[PDB]
Design a protein around this ligand. Structure first.
Ligand SMILES: Cc1c(C)c2c(c(C)c1O)CC[C@](C)(CCC[C@H](C)CCC[C@H](C)CCCC(C)C)O2
Length: 121
C-alpha cells in the first residue's frame, strides 16, 4: 500500500513521498495521461504500468512486508500479489533515487490539465 511504498521512497531518496512525489509531473499522483515530463515522471509512468499489470490485485491498497539486506530492499516471501506489488514499488523507489540528479522542483504541484494524450505501456 501507499504506506509501504512511501517508506521505500523515504529510505531510498531521503524525501517524504508525500508531498515530494505525490504531485510530481503527469504520473506521480493519481493522474495518468500525457508524456512524462522527465526521468522521475517516467519512473511513475512505469510504476503505473507495473500496477496496471496486477489486475488480480489491489496495488494501492494491499498491505505487504519487506526488509533490507546488505543495504538493499528485499521483498519477503508472501502472497503472489504482495510480492509483485512490493517489486513494483521497489523498482520505482530505486528509479526515483537513481534519478534524483534531475528531480526538478518545477514539476511539483503539476496541474493535470497540462497532461493529455494516451501513452501506451
Ligand atoms: C499510483 C501511484 C500512487 C498511488 C502514488 C505514487 C505514484 C508514483 C503512483 O504511480 C507516489 C505518491 C502517492 C501520492 C504515494 C506514498 C504513501 C506515504 C508518504 C507513506 C509512507 C510511509 C512511511 C515511510 C512509513 C515509515 C515507517 C517507519 C517509521 C518504521 O502514491
Amino acid at each position: 500500500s501507499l504506506l509501504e511504498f512511501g517508506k521505500m521512497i523515504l529510505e531510498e531518496t531521503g524525501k517524504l513521498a508525500i508531498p515530494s512525489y505525490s504531485s510530481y509531473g503527469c504520473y506521480c499522483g493519481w493522474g495518468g495521461k500525457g508524456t512524462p515530463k522527465d526521468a522521475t515522471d517516467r519512473c511513475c509512468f512505469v510504476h503505473d504500468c507495473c500496477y496496471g499489470n496486477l489486475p488480480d490485485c489491489n496495488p494501492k491498497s494491499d498491505r505487504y512486508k519487506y526488509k533490507r539486506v546488505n543495504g538493499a530492499i528485499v521483498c519477503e516471501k508472501g502472497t503472489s500479489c504482495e510480492n509483485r506489488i512490493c517489486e513494483c514499488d521497489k523498482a520505482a523507489a530505486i528509479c526515483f533515487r537513481q534519478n534524483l540528479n534531475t528531480y526538478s522542483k518545477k514539476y511539483m504541484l503539476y496541474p493535470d490539465f497540462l497532461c493529455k494524450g494516451e501513452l501506451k505501456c
